[PDB]
Design a protein around this nucleic acid. Structure first.
Ligand SMILES: Nc1ccn([C@H]2C[C@H](O)[C@@H](COP(=O)(O)O)O2)c(=O)n1
Ligand SMILES: [Mn+2]
Ligand SMILES: [Mn+2]
Ligand SMILES: [Mn+2]
Length: 688
DNA sequence: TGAGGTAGTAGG
DNA sequence: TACTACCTC
């Protein structure tokens, strides 16, 4: 049982390697010509070319000087140039002595399986870094899709083609997506057309026939022991034919990479008592902060004409929700203004939505709206009911909203199977039977997810963290880019235990792709004033979480926040680090992954936070970086892990911590004009 | 869109 | 960043 990482560190140092350096008065074509003529791995940066071996054929270009030298480790220019040379030499050593082809951003290896005109290829990606005078090489394994035939098969052998189809030109190095017959095709609107014997059709999931996406998906889900044993079996074959660097016989363990192993424990949640599991008291507990909710029902008549479900069947569903809500300490009352709008939400109302939507505002104000729109009307690209509802109900008038035919049909199929078809509204001793049949099966999670989405949008806190963290205030920041527009993702967590989780009441529209200084200052000041409002005292420490890389002004975070004599940390959280971690079991020769595992090396860490099943895939590690050093890094990791269990919006555990997950959701929603600011002191998460 | 997690694809 | 498939609860 040893901890394994998909990285290695070379025995040689950055200063133990001698290289040849040429400097010329950008210079891509010189390197290209030298590489073509000499058949040797070269690398270039700005106006300097570096290699491991001298160039024989000079290609008529004169440098100022030639050096057979060691690099200068105190400069970043010669550490960036060298990191590309090992990569290029490894690619060179992969193309020869191994049948690999540099396609896109990866190295296609070989065909593993063909599924009815669909070919799957294995591919690998390599990364080189220079850290602390050590050369680190990381590697990742992926797949690639291709179609067997080309435009010839759609011209010859019958068949035909139609305009708008996406085609792929793959000339080896990189591919573009757009002599018997010439077919025009354009994506950049620049005229181009040529032979239809090498343009293939695109192989994405969306443009793929059924019975394939069901079998092309079982050939990319390698559980834990076939994604890892196959990644190592190729690097260990590339090693045997690489001469410029040397490694240990087993360079994949974390000890060879200088990592430290930490095993975090499962937190506890508090609501009227201490519960070990988040899903342990939702069945048998009382919510931490209850209250009163006035719900509304928006019923569509297309839900009846096309699907044999009567409006009354909506109210024997709500009555099941309320009977569950009276337990846990929540009061739901149906608004009385919905009786004057009977027979109004017809099909023409969805075709004509913008013109006749204002008059709905008075009858839905100060309530929570439950929409029962059809799946088609939400998914259709003409009606676009979901986007309009989000943009009007929440984005304009600030009312929370939360069901298609699949849910109701599954509920009624369950009811019919159990044989209960009598009245289940305003009838005790029978709603309990419906609740019992709902339990012991998987629709209970659907019911509780709906209930939790209603609660968190109504201002109810379902639970907090039983124990206390090492920080006081948590701030989550995120940026979303779409169609040349950027949206910020401010998010506030007040209390060490996670007492009050809300969204910063700030205008998240950004002129640029980064947060302005004034916005950051206002965010910090409002965070301080909101923690003071609830706890009557100023916070002692604050930990800022940033999704991605910290690009803001670090010198300004302290300029205002020192003035309050409060300590702070800045943390970067990276999703998709393009690495994997495992626990190899020598006795059984099988890989596995354990939740709450940390690999630590200085101010950087890899964390495992999820436990997916065999058929879903393999867990994705998270990367944690600490820009500051005010607090121990272990206490930084512990807070990131514990904060991930505060998924009060849903009932299924999420991977990222609460701040950044809700920051991403808030940025996505507020990019689309679906959320508007609301000052207050309650748990407000409308975007979910 | 009940909720979430993983894996592919495209552009920046 | 965005999209699409699947499985799990
Ligand atoms: N493969 C990727 C990864 C990130 N991105 C986006 C997400 C961010 O807006 C930005 C990268 O930011 P960061 O590397 O700090 O996470 O580019 C992308 O467009 N393609
Ligand atoms: Mn981001
Ligand atoms: Mn995001
Ligand atoms: Mn939701």
């Amino acid at each position: 049982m040893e901890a394994y990482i998909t990285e290695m560190v070379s025995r040689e140092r950055a200063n133990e390697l001698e290289v040849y350096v040429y400097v010329f008065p950008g210079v891509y074509h010189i390197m290209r010509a030298w590489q073509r003529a000499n058949d040797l791995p070269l690398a270039y940066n700005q106006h300097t070319i570096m290699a491991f071996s001298p160039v024989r054929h000079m290609c008529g270009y004169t440098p100022m000087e030639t050096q057979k030298r060691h690099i200068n480790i105190d400069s970043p220019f010669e550490r960036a140039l060298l990191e590309r040379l090992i990569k290029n030499s490894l690619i060179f050593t992969a193309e020869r002595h191994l049948h690999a082809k540099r396609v896109g951003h990866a190295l296609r290896l070989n065909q593993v399986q063909q599924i009815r005109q669909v070919i799957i290829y294995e591919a690998i990606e390599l990364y080189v870094n220079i850290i602390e005078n050590r050369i680190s090489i990381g590697f990742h394994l992926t797949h690639q899709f291709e179609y067997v035939y080309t435009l010839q098969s759609m011209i010859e052998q019958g068949k035909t083609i139609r305009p708008g189809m996406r085609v792929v030109h793959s000339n080896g190095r990189q591919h573009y997506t757009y002599s018997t017959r010439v077919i025009h095709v354009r994506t950049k609107e620049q005229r181009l057309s040529y032979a239809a014997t090498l343009l293939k059709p695109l192989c994405t999931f969306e443009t793929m026939q059924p019975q394939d996406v069901l079998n092309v998906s079982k050939c990319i889900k390698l559980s834990a022991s076939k994604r890892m044993k196959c990644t190592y079996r190729w690097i260990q074959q590339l090693r045997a034919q690489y001469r410029h660097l040397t490694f240990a016989p087993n360079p994949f363990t974390i000890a060879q990479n200088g990592y430290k192993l930490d095993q975090l424990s499962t937190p506890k949640v508090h609501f009227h008592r201490d519960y070990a599991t988040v899903v342990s008291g939702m069945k048998t507990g009382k919510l931490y902060k209850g209250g009163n909710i006035k719900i509304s029902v928006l019923f569509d008549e297309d839900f009846y004409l096309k699907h044999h479900i009567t409006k009354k069947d909506i109210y024997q569903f709500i009555a099941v929700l309320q009977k569950i809500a009276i337990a846990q300490g929540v009061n739901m009352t149906i608004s009385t203004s919905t009786k004057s709008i009977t027979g109004k939400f017809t099909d023409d109302f969805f075709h004509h939505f913008t013109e006749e939507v204002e008059a709905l505002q008075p009858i839905f104000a100060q309530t929570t709206v439950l929409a029962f729109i059809t799946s088609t009307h939400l998914s259709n690209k003409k009606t676009r009911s979901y986007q309009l509802l989000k943009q009007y109900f929440g984005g304009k008038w600030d009312i929370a909203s939360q069901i298609t035919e699949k849910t109701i049909e599954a509920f009624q199929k369950i009811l019919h199977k159990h044989g209960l078809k009598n009245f289940y509204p305003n009838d005790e001793q029978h709603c309990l039977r419906v609740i019992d049949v709902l339990k012991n099966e998987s629709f209970y999670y659907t019911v509780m997810n709906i209930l939790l989405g209603v609660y968190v949008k109504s201002g109810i806190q379902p639970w907090i963290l039983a124990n206390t963290t090492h920080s006081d205030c948590f701030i989550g920041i995120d940026v979303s880019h779409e169609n040349g527009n950027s949206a910020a993702g401010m998010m506030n967590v007040i209390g060490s235990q996670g007492h009050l989780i809300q969204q910063a009441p700030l205008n998240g529209i950004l002129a640029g792709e980064k947060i302005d200084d004034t916005l950051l200052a206002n965010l910090l000041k409002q965070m301080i004033k909101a923690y003071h409002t609830q706890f009557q005292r100023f916070p002692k420490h604050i930990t800022i979480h940033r999704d991605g890389f910290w690009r803001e002004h670090t010198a300004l975070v302290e300029k205002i926040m020192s003035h309050y004599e409060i300590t702070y940390d800045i943390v970067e959280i990276i999703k998709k680090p393009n690495r994997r971690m495992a626990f190899f079991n020598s006795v059984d020769n099988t890989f596995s992954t354990r939740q709450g595992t940390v690999y630590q090396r200085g101010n950087e860490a890899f964390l495992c936070a999820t436990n997916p099943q065999q058929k879903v895939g393999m867990a994705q590690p998270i990367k944690i970086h600490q820009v500051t050093k005010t607090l121990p890094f272990s206490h930084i990791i512990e807070d990131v892990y514990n904060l991930s269990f505060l998924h009060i919006h849903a009932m299924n555990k999420m991977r990222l911590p609460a701040t950044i997950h809700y920051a991403d959701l808030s940025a996505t929603a507020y990019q689309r004009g679906q959320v508007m600011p609301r000052s207050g002191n309650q748990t407000n998460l409308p975007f979910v």
